[PDB]
């Protein structure tokens, strides 16, 4: 008896605002693109860790009907997608622009510094530091984010990028509070639209995931 | 958005077997029913504690054996029209043998202590029901009639309905459409219809919901972290 919250409720309303990635972000993305980094499956944990962070942030707002606090994965073999949705704190428009566009992540500063100071392949250095959210672009043709801040009266947004130069933001209706990230997989990365492949990855660490984690409606952790 | 699992999926398929309560159980029922004990709301925690126990038992069966994990939740629902309050858990459930033995006897240790203390002391039942509790039979503080469905988590298990009006006898019959775990439907006495009010149940449960070890819902609303 399965438990799913992921469905196509969202629709883009009105016009698009166009944004450029920070220079350092473009550099990071290009390095990832042209690296031969083989453990691309890391993007799943990067996104689950972010979902967990967002749910933890939501707790900080609680005092004495509690909000649902869940992380959902869904694979779609036919569409070549993998989706992660959390019911956590979400992002304002300002937050989308800043958080998904810059190199604020402390590990990513360390990463970029390591590129200058280590006589190692980039793949090894990606292994050492990680690249956080941008790990999605290991596997994605295109990344499609919907987010709505848990703050009352906040609007929903769509953030779009193919990971080259530019990202877009538009207002969206039908966005649940929290964040949904839809990864449109590369033609050579379709393995991550398979339930079995994703289960095998996530099983290795689901016991360490602090919130309820579902894969295609099936509960993965205690 | 609400989260509810409680609905009328069950129906009796099997013959009815009628059972007499053990004499000591009859005696405890008798004592509790007639008591001036006024803190009747306790039955709600009694049932939630049992739901929790059942869900904890289900954990003990889990191993890292591949698949999904079972949902582990406790649900309360009130129905003001029908004069009911229902509690459903998705835990270990009860075999037929377990229904007859577990809901039928006074194995419970605090109930043996209760009866001992009532006999060999001069405190009235009011007090010492509060001290000891009377577990599952607390339901008969507030119930005209108690309606239980249960199916054991054990592979192969059938579903059963257990019925009692709390006087002398209980019935059991095989039932279809029982989810693994236990649903308890309390058909409330006339002077007890307050426990079919959501606000009444909420105000009671809020006092201890953050000590409840599993997700707890009231009419589809989450009550605890
Ligand atoms: N699911 C999400 N919900 C809300 N905020 C998000 C989500 N995913 C990413 N973010 C924002 O994007 C930022 C960057 O994410 P990420 O690149 O993983 O770095 P980080 O999580 O800050 N640090 P690290 O612990 O090294 O991953 C986060 O700090 C959040 O502010
Ligand atoms: N929801 C339930 N699911 C499974 N078994 C149940 C359920 N409720 C009651 N039982 C069984 O009925 C027995 C009696 O319950 P109860 O009268 O509360 O005593 P107890 O729970 O054993 N001891 P105490 O800790 O004092 O409540 C339990 O031990 C269970 O075996
Ligand atoms: Mg992160
Ligand atoms: Mg008990």
Swiss-Prot record, chain A:
Kindly report the protein's main subcellular placement as a broad class.
mitochondrion
Keyword Thylakoid on this protein? no
GO terms (BP aspect): chaperone-mediated protein folding; negative regulation of cellular respiration; negative regulation of intrinsic apoptotic signaling pathway in response to hydrogen peroxide; negative regulation of reactive oxygen species biosynthetic process; protein folding; translational attenuation
Locate the Phosphoserine modifications and list their residues: 98, 122
- The entry's keywords: Acetylation, ATP-binding, Chaperone, Membrane, Mitochondrion, Mitochondrion inner membrane, Nucleotide-binding, Phosphoprotein, Transit peptide
Q: Which residues carry this modification: N6-acetyllysine?
A: 190
Instruction: Reply yes or no: does the keyword Thylakoid apply.
Output: no
Tell me where in this chain the PTM Phosphothreonine is found. Answer: 102
Q: Where in the cell is it found?
A: Mitochondrion; Mitochondrion inner membrane; Mitochondrion matrix
Give me the disulphide-bonded residues: none
- Description of how the protein assembles with itself and partners: Binds to the intracellular domain of tumor necrosis factor type 1 receptor. Binds to RB1. Interacts with SRC. Interacts with SDHA.
What the protein does comes down to: Chaperone that expresses an ATPase activity. Involved in maintaining mitochondrial function and polarization, downstream of PINK1 and mitochondrial complex I. Is a negative regulator of mitochondrial respiration able to modulate the balance between oxidative phosphorylation and aerobic glycolysis. The impact of TRAP1 on mitochondrial respiration is probably mediated by modulation of mitochondrial SRC and inhibition of SDHA.
Which family is this protein grouped under?
Belongs to the heat shock protein 90 family.
Which protein, by its recorded name, is this?
A: Heat shock protein 75 kDa, mitochondrial
Portion of the full-length sequence here: 70 to 294 of 704
Curated annotation (Swiss-Prot), chain B:
Location(s) in or outside the cell: Mitochondrion; Mitochondrion inner membrane; Mitochondrion matrix
**UniProt modified residues of type N6-acetyllysine:** 193
Gene name, Swiss-Prot/TrEMBL? TRAP1
- Phosphothreonine is carried by which residues? 105
Q: How does it assemble?
A: Binds to the intracellular domain of tumor necrosis factor type 1 receptor. Binds to RB1. Interacts with SRC. Interacts with SDHA.
Which protein is depicted?
Answer: Heat shock protein 75 kDa, mitochondrial
Q: Which family does it belong to?
A: Belongs to the heat shock protein 90 family.
* Modified residue annotations for Phosphoserine: 101, 125
Q: What does this protein do?
A: Chaperone that expresses an ATPase activity. Involved in maintaining mitochondrial function and polarization, downstream of PINK1 and mitochondrial complex I. Is a negative regulator of mitochondrial respiration able to modulate the balance between oxidative phosphorylation and aerobic glycolysis. The impact of TRAP1 on mitochondrial respiration is probably mediated by modulation of mitochondrial SRC and inhibition of SDHA.
User: How would you summarize where this protein is expressed among tissues?
Assistant: Found in skeletal muscle, liver, heart, brain, kidney, pancreas, lung, placenta and bladder. Expression is highly reduced in bladder cancer and renal cell carcinoma specimens compared to healthy tissues, but it is increased in other type of tumors.
């Amino acid at each position: 008896p399965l438990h799913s919250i992921i469905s196509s409720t969202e629709s883009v309303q009105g016009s698009t605002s166009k944004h450029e990635f920070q220079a350092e972000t473009k550099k990071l993305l290009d390095i990832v693109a042209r690296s031969l980094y083989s453990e691309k499956e890391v993007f799943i944990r990067e996104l689950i860790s972010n979902a967990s962070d967002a749910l933890e942030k939501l707790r900080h707002k609680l005092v004495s009907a509690l909000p649902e606090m869940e992380i959902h994965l869904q694979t779609n073999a036919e569409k070549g997608t993998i989706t992660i949705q959390d019911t956590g704190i979400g992002m304002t428009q300002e937050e989308l622009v800043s958080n998904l566009g810059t190199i604020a992540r402390s590990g990513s500063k360390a990463f970029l510094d390591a590129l200058q100071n280590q006589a190692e392949a980039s793949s090894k250095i990606i292994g050492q530091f990680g690249v956080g959210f941008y790990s999605a672009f290991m596997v994605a043709d295109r990344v499609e984010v919907y987010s709505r801040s848990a703050a009352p009266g906040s609007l929903g947004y769509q953030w779009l990028s193919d990971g080259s130069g530019v990202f877009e933001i538009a207002e969206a209706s039908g966005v649940r509070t929290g964040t949904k990230i839809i990864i449109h997989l590369k033609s050579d990365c379709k393995e991550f639209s398979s339930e079995a492949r994703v289960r095998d990855v996530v099983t290795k660490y689901s016991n360490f995931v602090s919130f309820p984690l579902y894969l295609n409606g099936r509960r993965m952790n205690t």
